[PDB]
Amino acid sequence: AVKDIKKLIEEGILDYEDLTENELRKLAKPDDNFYELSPYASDEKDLSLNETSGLTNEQLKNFLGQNGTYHMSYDSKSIDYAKQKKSEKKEDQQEDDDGFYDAYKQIKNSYDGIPNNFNHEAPQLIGNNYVFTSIYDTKENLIKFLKKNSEYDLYD
Amino acid sequence: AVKDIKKLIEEGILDYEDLTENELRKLAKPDDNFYELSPYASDEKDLSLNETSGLTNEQLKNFLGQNGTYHMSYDSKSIDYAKQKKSEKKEDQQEDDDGFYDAYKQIKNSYDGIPNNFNHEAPQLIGNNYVFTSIYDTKENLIKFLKKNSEYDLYD
Amino acid sequence: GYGDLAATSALTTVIKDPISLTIKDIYEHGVKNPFTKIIHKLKKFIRYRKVLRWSRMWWVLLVREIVGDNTIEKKTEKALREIWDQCTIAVYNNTLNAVESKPLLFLHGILNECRNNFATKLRQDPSLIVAKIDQIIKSQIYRFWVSEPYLKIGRSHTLYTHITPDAVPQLPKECTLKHLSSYMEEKLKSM
Amino acid sequence: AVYNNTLNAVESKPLLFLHGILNECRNNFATKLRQDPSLIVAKIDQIIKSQIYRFWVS
Amino acid sequence: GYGDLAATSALTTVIKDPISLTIKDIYEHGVK
């Protein structure tokens, strides 16, 4: 009151209401694990990129633009190809968890500004200020404080 | 002060600041391993050439030229095709290092004017003079000297 | 002399042929193409009134769940609203049941089709549009999309352009993706 | 191509967009640029696969 | 002078070529 001091005491003693503008902005500043050099990201199934996607055909977009008595509104060539592969691989034993357990972590990271394999700190605009959140350091109590108190108030 | 004399003494005794114009240009001249005849280059995965590349379709370039409400900006036919081959080869045991070690050496050689499998001396324009750098003889101390001292100075 | 008819044939095509070619682009790109986009916008309005009372009622609930109260970009929310309206026209043309009668049949159509419609054109979704419509279907959160306040506005005689996110009541906090994804890390990270 | 696929604002969550825009131009340059002796595709690989695009947001 | 035949060639295509192109859509989309 400095940055590592707040992570222990503000859970026990200090409320967020009694903190200055130079103290709130530095807790939203990135930590010392940021600016630490880290190679070798761990690859996983990217739910962001769609391998079954295709290009705008412009004759579908013309025919679907003229609204009326059409019965299918996409191409279905690449997405049947994709489903055929899952019928032919015979990979079940952990993929029964991968679509069902894996999706949840990356979906919650989309509400924090964090992409798929991003094990580091990513910002999130709350009001007029950015808050760098993590996979581990979610900083949820700062988010509840800055949304509720600084709705009609400004603390940089 | 000649060329092989500088590689031993200038690390110990001589600074680069006290060197004449006929001495700086000859240390940037190529060595005697240059003009030595060497066949049989060693092939590696060329990160320069993209096997997944294609041709300008000119109907994509027209449709992407008219900016607005398009959702994918490339072709994705050849880059999905390549990924299927890596799923079918079952080659893992060293290719887990080939994409992950190899990029680093060839990427640093791009900052020195050196292509992928080039085990010899390649130039690099610094100011108004060329400096022949190597995989092994990086000549980094000449590069720090010619950028800093000869920014507003000229020594051929 | 025939130099008198030289300039008459000259300034014929000097003034006719430019103006003839300007109109072929002014009428095509400035008169044809907007007037069709007015007609084919009216074809969504003369038809499809009963559907878009419900579709825009569902589309606001995707924008609230995929984003999760973190200010929505207005320009490409309407660009994907058109792709959402193409799922509803494609489902409603395939139904004999009324929309008012059985509405959760339609969400198994419209969400399943825009699960596939967005997966065939949207290449990369860092907001995870395809990936979240997956687990709205595969965990059946679209139950609460039909509730007491959502059937009142659905049955009401209001035009679909008047359905704004201000006029749609918000789901309670038990019924969103923000809770259900965080509740799995209360289980699966703990277990 | 990325911004048309987002419902989140650009101002709100910017590192979502670099996982789009770098991943797409990783693939967009790999489908048209045949030979990159400046290694445009190969360096955008390890900006993503080693996550250097952290410091791009500061 | 030849500015007299300027406006005759002007208001020829000012009135012919719009009405010629309106009918190609009125007859096609509203009559054909």
How far off is chain C from B33, nearest CA to CA, in Å?
50
Residue that is written with structure tokens 């003839």 in the block = C20
Q: Hey, which bits of chain C come out as E strands? A: none
Touching, B vs D (3+ Cβ pairs under 8 A): yes
Residue among B60, B67, B71, B79 with most chain C CBs within 10 A, to mutate: B71
Burial of B156 (C-beta count, 10 Å sphere; 0-12/13-18/19+): exposed
| Rg, chain E, Cα only | 14
Distance, CA of A45 to CA of C34 (rounded, Å):
43
How far off is chain C from A110, nearest CA to CA, in Å?
6
Residues in chain B: 156
| Rg, chain A, Cα only | 23
Residue at B84: amino acid letter: Q
Residues in chain E: 32
Helix, strand, coil % over all residues of chain B, rounded to 5? 35, 5, 60
First to last CA, chain A: 16
Would the CB atoms of C121 and A74 count as touching at under 8 Å?
A: yes
Residues in chain C: 191
Would the CB atoms of E18 and C23 count as touching at under 8 Å?
A: yes
CB-based contact (8 Å) between B101 and chain A?
A: no
Distance, CA of D42 to CA of B116 (rounded, Å):
12
Q: Three-class SS of residue B51?
A: coil
| Residue among D1, D24, D30 minimizing CB distance to B50 | D30
Question: Among B105, B148, B139, which residue's Cα sits nearest to residue B29?
Answer: B139
- Residues of chain C in contact with residue A48, where contact means CB-CB under 8 angstroms, are 124-126, 128, 131
Distance, CA of B52 to CA of B31 (rounded, Å):
38
Question: Among C143, C77, C153, C83, which residue's Cα sits nearest to residue C113?
Answer: C83
- Strands A129-130 and B129-130 come out as unpaired
Torsion of CA C157, C160, C166, C170, to 10 degrees: 80
Q: How far is CA C79 from the centre of its chain?
A: 6
Resolution rounded to one decimal, in angstroms? 4.2
Burial of A115 (C-beta count, 10 Å sphere; 0-12/13-18/19+): buried
CA distances from A39 to A30, B104, B107, D49, D53 (A): 18, 11, 15, 8, 11
Q: Count Cβ–Cβ pairs < 8 Å, chain A vs chain C.
A: 110
Neighbours of chain C (3+ CB pairs under 8 A): A, B, D, E
| Residue among A49, A70, A108 minimizing CB distance to C185 | A108
Question: Among C106, C90, B72, which residue's Cα sits nearest to residue A76?
Answer: C90
